Symmetry: C4
Amino acid sequence: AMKIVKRALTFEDVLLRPGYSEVLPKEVKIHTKLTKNITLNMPLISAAMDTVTEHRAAIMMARLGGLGVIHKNMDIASQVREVKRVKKSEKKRKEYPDANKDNFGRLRVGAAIGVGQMDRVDALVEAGVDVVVLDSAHGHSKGIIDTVKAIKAKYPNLDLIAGNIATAAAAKALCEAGVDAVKVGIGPGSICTTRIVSGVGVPQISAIDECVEEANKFGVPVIADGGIKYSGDIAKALAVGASSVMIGSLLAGTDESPGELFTYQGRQYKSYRGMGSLGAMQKLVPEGIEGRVPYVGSIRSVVHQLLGGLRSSMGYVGAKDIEDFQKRAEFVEITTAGLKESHVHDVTITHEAPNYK
Amino acid sequence: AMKIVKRALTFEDVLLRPGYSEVLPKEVKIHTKLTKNITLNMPLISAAMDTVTEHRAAIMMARLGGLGVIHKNMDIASQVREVKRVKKSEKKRKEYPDANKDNFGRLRVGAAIGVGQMDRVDALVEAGVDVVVLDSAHGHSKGIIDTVKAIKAKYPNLDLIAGNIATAAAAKALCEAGVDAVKVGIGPGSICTTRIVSGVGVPQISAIDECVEEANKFGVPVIADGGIKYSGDIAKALAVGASSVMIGSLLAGTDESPGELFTYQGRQYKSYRGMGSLGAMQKLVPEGIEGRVPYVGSIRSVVHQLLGGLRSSMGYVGAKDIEDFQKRAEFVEITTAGLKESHVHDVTITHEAPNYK
Amino acid sequence: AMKIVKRALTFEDVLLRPGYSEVLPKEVKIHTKLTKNITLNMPLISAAMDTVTEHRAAIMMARLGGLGVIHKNMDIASQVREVKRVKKSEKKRKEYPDANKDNFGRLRVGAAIGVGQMDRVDALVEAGVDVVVLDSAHGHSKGIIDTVKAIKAKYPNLDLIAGNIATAAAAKALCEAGVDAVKVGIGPGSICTTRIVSGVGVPQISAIDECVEEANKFGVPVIADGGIKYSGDIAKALAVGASSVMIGSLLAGTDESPGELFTYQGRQYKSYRGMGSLGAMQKLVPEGIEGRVPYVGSIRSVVHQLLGGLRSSMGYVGAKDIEDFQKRAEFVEITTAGLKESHVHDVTITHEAPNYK
Amino acid sequence: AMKIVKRALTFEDVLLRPGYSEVLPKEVKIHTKLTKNITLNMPLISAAMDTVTEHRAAIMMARLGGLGVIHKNMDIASQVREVKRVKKSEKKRKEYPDANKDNFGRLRVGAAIGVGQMDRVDALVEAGVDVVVLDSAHGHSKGIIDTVKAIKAKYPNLDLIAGNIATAAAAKALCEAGVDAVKVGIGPGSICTTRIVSGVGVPQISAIDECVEEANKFGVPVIADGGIKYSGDIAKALAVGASSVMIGSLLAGTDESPGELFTYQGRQYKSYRGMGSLGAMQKLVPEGIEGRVPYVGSIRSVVHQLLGGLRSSMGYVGAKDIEDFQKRAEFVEITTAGLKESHVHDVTITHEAPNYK
Ligand SMILES: O=c1[nH]cnc2c1ncn2[C@@H]1O[C@H](COP(=O)(O)O)[C@@H](O)[C@H]1O
Ligand SMILES: O=c1[nH]cnc2c1ncn2[C@@H]1O[C@H](COP(=O)(O)O)[C@@H](O)[C@H]1O
Ligand SMILES: O=c1[nH]cnc2c1ncn2[C@@H]1O[C@H](COP(=O)(O)O)[C@@H](O)[C@H]1O
Ligand SMILES: O=c1[nH]cnc2c1ncn2[C@@H]1O[C@H](COP(=O)(O)O)[C@@H](O)[C@H]1O
Ligand SMILES: [Cl-]
Ligand SMILES: [Cl-]
Ligand SMILES: [Cl-]
Ligand SMILES: [Cl-]
Ligand SMILES: [K+]
Ligand SMILES: [K+]
Ligand SMILES: [K+]
Ligand SMILES: [K+]
């Protein structure tokens, strides 16, 4: 007989219960850990995609307290240049009081690599990258493990993030290999078709919960990657036990993301595509699609709304910080009817909301 | 691992079972308690919103046996004036035989306040307000509790409603602080985006059930606030154990609600917006949206249909009054298919129904 | 705490499992019992509605082996005339070899009455009606029980159907009062809004199952009334334990139903409305709506497709007749995904199907 | 009371969990068994439908390593001719290195028959057909069993596939009759209305799982027939325990399928209809509909994408071949929210994907 391990849930399946609160949303602390050795002042990371993060997106993310990960869909020299532009970037000191900087007062930056790309790692390291993100469609693989070990052997002090995974067994394997963080997410991405093309995946809330419980045994932070639609999803992911959240679609339509604006039927858009899509890979068998997202202005405006939502959540739960948030957190499972009730219902929206579209 | 406390249900998830009946809908009694000391002749309350309740809406609600709560999105002098207009309001004596009046034959009225607004409380009291509604997005908070205690210390005999809450622990805290009623509803409002923005909330049926069980220990009435779409939702909320129901959207498009009619594509509408929306609050992080509702005529016509539905329900269950209704009530949980079956299906509606839109 | 008795299912929630079969659909027997004393050659009954059944619809239903119930939205003299037209109706003898006739070779006919309408009963009886259908929105009531007893006391041999009900307790009460059949269905009707207006109802599959188990103790047949969308629903209702099925919407758009054809956007329709709708009742509080259904030709063509579906079902299960069908029947509960899979999916229909619209 | 045997699942209800992998998608082996005696190099079979498989579709399927089944909606002489064209068909030898051939280097081919069609069997055998597919709407029947026994008695070495079934009891009966494979699928077909017309069927994932467990006791392969929408469904069906998959809709819009291209609103389509539809059968009671599918180019291009998806899946699970795949396979049950998350969400697709439409 078939082995059904569990009934897995995603963000829309659950809600946080309110708790007794003595703290205001403006008073709570949202600092967190990116890796074992790197801290963030905000728990947000921009995705390593060629329609989301290059040097300017990464600069703004670090300035606001988070991090940007330069994508790997470019030559080594180009990625080095993007990394250097971020490091050399730094009026600003209290225009951006929460800026995420290294020991030398330079903005933090991450960069993506693939399996066996040791040459790329060497160049990124000497370029002064703060963290390397070893990403694959399947992080629980021999190629990924071998690469982790090779990098750690050559650069023992280089912070290394590995992914993506969706099981406790995968988290254990990566942690035992010595990673400094694991990235969780198989299939939940907005532009991802992995679950449909391959039939493989785990609903993100359950994936995070399972991997966090295992990763916690090693003191290794979990990055929740993909599937974030609203600010409330950020809160849920962190409450479940994730230390940080990686975002693609919500940042693709900003000023700072690569690509240009274009008008379509009197509306402005930006291109957003999976890194496993045909376009990005250029017969291939794609695990992503090429699409469009509405233009939403600046990264700072988006981030402000996202963090505002997170602060509101911690206020409802009564949490003074993220660790406290995770300790207090209690969930209820809801139905489709509950989800319908949660959204705007039976009223025709006439004005655009900053955090609800 | 994540702590999922329960699988929570809302109105669409459940239905009342019919019981043996010896009573006709026209014969049942629908009087109830607003607070420990204030009775209603009808279990309906209009929401404290600037697109729902000012003096004229409040006057009609009290005349029909219920109550209106003057919103707090105005200066103290203005709210005092609105309260006074209702109190001085009182052909009518059996044009409106079920009118909700105080000891002096004056129409009952409520008024909303916020945390720390003691000056506003003083003025409303001397204006002769019958009940003060201390509402917050998060009633289970230090600010709310402290305000309850401060008001009770200065005005021991002033009826006080506090909210909003969604847990038994919250109900306990408010009741122990000495409130005369608790208002239940975190997220179910038609214009509410709290559950989406913050990820926090509890499906309304389960929220009511949980808070009622706790509040009953103190002899404190529960007000079911938000998420009411049809008259059947009123019946469900009361049957579960709520003593009264607060309504926003279903009353926003009436003659008596603030704001003017406007035509759009040959149809008339009225503005309806969350009190946490950008417009009502006027970067902010909104927990509500600004929208529109169809014009539906008079408050009396709407109320008649709502109460008609409630009377029908009690007739089906065989209840002579609300208390009996709550004792007899038995529910079944249904599926999405059951909900589809419950609504109008496989038939194209050609004539508008008074209670089904 | 709220008392949730069960998780109730309707037709879309379940499917019949195939069994070993030695019988062909053309060979199975579909005769059944209407009441304790009246047999049908087909298990179909047309609804007692003024847009479904008058004398000509009733005549065709009886000719095809089933029954029609003349509605009560007319004066006593008019209903008597309709009943007489059916009785006096009887080339036909093997144009319609399965005709449902009484001892005198006259077509069987039913007629609807309400609570306390003894005058109407007297006239229908002397008009030679075969069965009286005492219907109410709430069959589990004192008014219905008292009427059953009064009719049985005056006409001991008059077959009496009473409804509508949805619980075992209701079935017990009616059976103990001496009814010859119970009609099950609170809310599932296509034009019904009872569950939405009053919040009261039970999903039809569970309602049938519960009432059948109780009614079987008295040897009393159960009529499944309302919610039938496809021929497969007929099979499910009968398999669960119902002895017959009452249909409204699927017969409203036929030649024989009352009302005239009308064209709308190049398409022909017929009026179909709830008997609790404003129009049919002519401030009232309606429990039904007024609508339209596509014109579908003759009653015989519709019935042929419905019975064809039932025959196919019994063939799949391997049942030689209805009683055998009910004994063999095994169900699986499905998900929304299963229901989607069951319908036509991922293919654009280009030709109209006789039994699938 | 009604007997609900189980809560049955289909493809959309489940997802595969990723496992530790040391194999690349390009390295995995996808050979499998069609019957006890016939092997496939690819696990795909084209459906026996007059809008899917005749000689040219069958030729391409065998060339790519799978099989085509010539439909039976034609005279015996015509089906013989189609079979002969495939057998006589065989630059190609490593244009198509994975071709599915018999002992004589001729392309494998199947042909459909019905109950009692012994004359047709005789002619197909002497025409050199490799396998006969005895299909019925109800494989668990006396007619099918008797036909299996008659064929085996006359042609002991003729590979025989029988279907369709959906229960373990049905699988047992066919296997004990001596079939070489069972075909599973009652109702899941894209053009199928059986579950709606008759109320009979079993969600395909549970159907496969149940029949595989029984068929495995006899060493008899299970063919998963119908309901395949995406390549991920192929992976799920095989992972559950099916040895091969039969496909209709995904192959109907190819060059090689019977019927001609036609333009509609600037788009090209091909006809696709159920073999139980009115058109294919030409009052009848249809269990299928007549429709259209988009033109998708060549069979080879479609197959490449389907197999690419399967290879990706086995890579995620870490399976070196199909048997290993079935041993490693672990599933999670998901919700509607999880399914929504799995598909493309919150992004407007602007470019057509080869494997996602
Ligand atoms: O094409 C791809 N296929 C599958 N996943 C992808 C692809 N491209 C990006 N992703 C993942 O999806 C995430 C974006 O998720 P989003 O926030 O929902 O748009 C990225 O951070 C990657 O983890
Ligand atoms: O903007 C807001 N954010 C969240 N909840 C609100 C807001 N404004 C009003 N509410 C709540 O929603 C209720 C109205 O619910 P309704 O009957 O569904 O429209 C009010 O009585 C308040 O409890
Ligand atoms: O207006 C009404 N309100 C509620 N139920 C009704 C009303 N009129 C007819 N019905 C019921 O609905 C059935 C028709 O169900 P249908 O087959 O789904 O259209 C009738 O036989 C009655 O039992
Ligand atoms: O008209 C019919 N009624 C029911 N099932 C059919 C009919 N025609 C074909 N089928 C089945 O549906 C399958 C096609 O499934 P598809 O891959 O979803 O289109 C065929 O292989 C048959 O097993
Ligand atoms: Cl620049
Ligand atoms: Cl005025
Ligand atoms: Cl006539
Ligand atoms: Cl040719
Ligand atoms: K809401
Ligand atoms: K209904
Ligand atoms: K189907
Ligand atoms: K996805």
